Amino acid sequence: SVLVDKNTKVLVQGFTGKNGTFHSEQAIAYGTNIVGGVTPGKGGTTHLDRPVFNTMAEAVAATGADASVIYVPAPFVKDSAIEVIDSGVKLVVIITEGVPTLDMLVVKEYLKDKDVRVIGPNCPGIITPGECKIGIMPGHIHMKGKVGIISRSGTLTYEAVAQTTKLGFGQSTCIGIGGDPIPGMNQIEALKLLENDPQTEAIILIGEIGGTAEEEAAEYIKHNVTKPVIGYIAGVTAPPGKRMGHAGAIISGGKGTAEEKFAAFEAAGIAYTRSPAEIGKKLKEVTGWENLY
């Protein structure tokens, strides 16, 4: 596994809010160590039988948290992200959708000399099945195993999880890097981590239209990733010049098409499927893994 495990201590920014409350309840039930959270104006209260703090500095001093998840509305995300970056927390998961692109441009630049990883925004988070979940993904579809998953989508990731669970392979760590044009953690960062993780024996890379990240990741894999990678790209049928839900899912200047992504996997010797139903099956073919169950 990478980044999170049973020892991870998690703070929640926007802890007292609707989604912070709901997903924190689930996280506690799952076995995630939620140590408290931050909501300005509710410092010194308790929530879900955990302390609430006004500031991340107070929270981190009190709890020695090493991760944080952000459920704050988009307007306050740049503020919240810098706050946690400055706090001593090493891992930040940003769930929130609608963060301005230029806010992540600045945050991503701010991170360049820091010792902090940021996953998201507009992502379901990170899960090490059997150990720790940070985000909104349903624990029950996952199983502790050997397939690492990197994905720009939410529910499409759950299909690959369902397929690898059913084939009995299970997941090491699944990283939802999110649907935005400038993520805090890109595919190459995540591939490096999984390549170095002994629990991960194979990797699924899920992408979609927009940007050139999959092509760049392809070139990186060719030279630097020894574990088998199985790719899949959503949006073959997407019309050009249209946002397909996610801010980053858009073809423009005839670039960011699904086909050029498949073709890049081709050229790099990376295995892939053209059907979302056959991700697990393609992985099975490539690995030769077998089990009568």
Partner: protein
């Protein structure tokens, strides 16, 4: 969010750029009056629509009298304009702009900027090839596109704009005017949360002035909460009626040309579903992301969006319930179907949380819902329902 030509010009003027100025007219008398107000031998009347290709489509006319202006406005206002960059219905023309004549000119440049996703930096592009589609230039002669990556800490510096001005072969006051143009555009870009802009052409007039003749600005819609004056520019008439309606019900909808409608939670999965439909011989009719916690009301609106297309002959609902129980989702789907005229076969794939209790509720609702096991099953069945 896109801006009208006159709105983009007003914005850029406010950051000190020079523009081909005009007056907006909502009726032909107002257009005639604008012509006399400008007080020039010639003006250019331009349909205000969010689209390029306006001239080719008959939406740009040079005029020499108030009478000619009224005629042109009367011809344009209240009709939709179809251009090579619109869909087949075109964009409504509710107004024209009557613009001052700034020609003849010495030469035409291109200037624009994007947020480059690979470098993660605001990037400017400039060329000697103004009045050419810059995509063609990029493809055929990439060496003619000059690029400047901006460092977020320092911003665009005068020396970077001078490097460009010298490579463009500008001379004299043209250099300092071009530098001020690029610096002002950068300030606007950040201060307004632009996603991209293009000025094409950026004219070098006979007296050396650097003038924005036609310009487009696309704003980051997700930043408009902090720009009330920019949000106030929004022209909903230029947005697709169904896309707009979907947005009002926490749905994301895009129409295609096909015969199988789709309803999915999550954008990745919605595009994947469209893709597997086509793999299995079908033609996806739409993208539709119903989001998390789809209620009865929200599913009703999704049905109405899809079936408003007469070409739709079957629907696939594909929902992966994680935090929300599949039997509760099945309840909402059943309640929704009961309120809508659902005239086509509906295949339903419900997976995740209690997929089994959900599938049974569907099977016993007596609405002829076709239950599907996996993604492959769902595609296979919805295409087969076409006969």
């Amino acid at each position: 969010m896109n801006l009208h030509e006159y709105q983009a010009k007003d914005l850029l003027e406010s950051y000190g750029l020079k523009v081909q100025k005009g007056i907006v007219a909502h009726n032909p008398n107002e257009a005639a009056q604008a012509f006399d107000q400008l007080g020039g031998k010639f003006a250019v009347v331009k349909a205000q629509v969010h689209a390029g290709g306006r001239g080719k489509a008959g939406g740009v006319k040079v005029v020499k009298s108030s009478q000619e202006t009224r005629e042109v406005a009367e011809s344009l206002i209240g009709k939709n304009l179809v251009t090579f960059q619109t869909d087949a219905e075109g964009q409504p023309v509710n107004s024209v702009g009557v613009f001052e004549d700034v020609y003849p000119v010495t030469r035409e440049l291109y200037l624009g900027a994007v947020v480059d996703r690979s470098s993660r930096k605001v990037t400017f592009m400039a060329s000697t090839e103004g009045g050419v589609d810059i995509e063609e230039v990029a493809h055929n002669s990439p060496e003619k596109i000059l690029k400047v990556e901006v460092d977020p800490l320092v911003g665009l510096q005068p020396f970077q704009a001078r490097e460009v001005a010298f490579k463009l072969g500008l001379e004299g006051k043209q250099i300092n005017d071009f530098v001020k143009t690029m610096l002002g555009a950068y300030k606007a870009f950040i201060e307004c949360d632009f996603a991209l802009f293009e000025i094409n052409p950026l004219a070098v007039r006979e007296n050396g002035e650097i003038v924005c003749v036609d310009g487009k600005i696309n704003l980051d819609s997700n930043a408009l909460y902090r720009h009330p004056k920019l949000l106030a520019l929004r022209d909903k008439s230029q947005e697709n009626a169904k896309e707009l309606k979907a947005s009002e019900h926490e749905l994301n909808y895009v129409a295609l040309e096909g015969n199988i409608g789709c309803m999915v939670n999550g954008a990745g999965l919605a595009m994947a579903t469209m893709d597997i439909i086509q793999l299995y011989g079908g033609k996806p009719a739409n993208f539709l992301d119903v989001g998390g916690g789809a209620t009865k009301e929200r599913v009703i609106e999704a049905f109405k969006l899809i079936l408003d297309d007469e070409n739709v002959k079957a629907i696939l609902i594909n929902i992966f319930g994680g935090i929300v129980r599949c039997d509760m989702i099945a309840e909402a789907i059943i309640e929704a179907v009961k309120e809508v005229n659902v005239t086509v076969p509906v295949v339903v794939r419900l997976e995740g949380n209690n997929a089994e209790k959900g599938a049974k509720i569907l099977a016993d609702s007596g609405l002829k819902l076709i239950p599907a096991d996996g993604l492959a099953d769902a595609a296979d069945k919805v295409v087969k329902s076409l006969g």
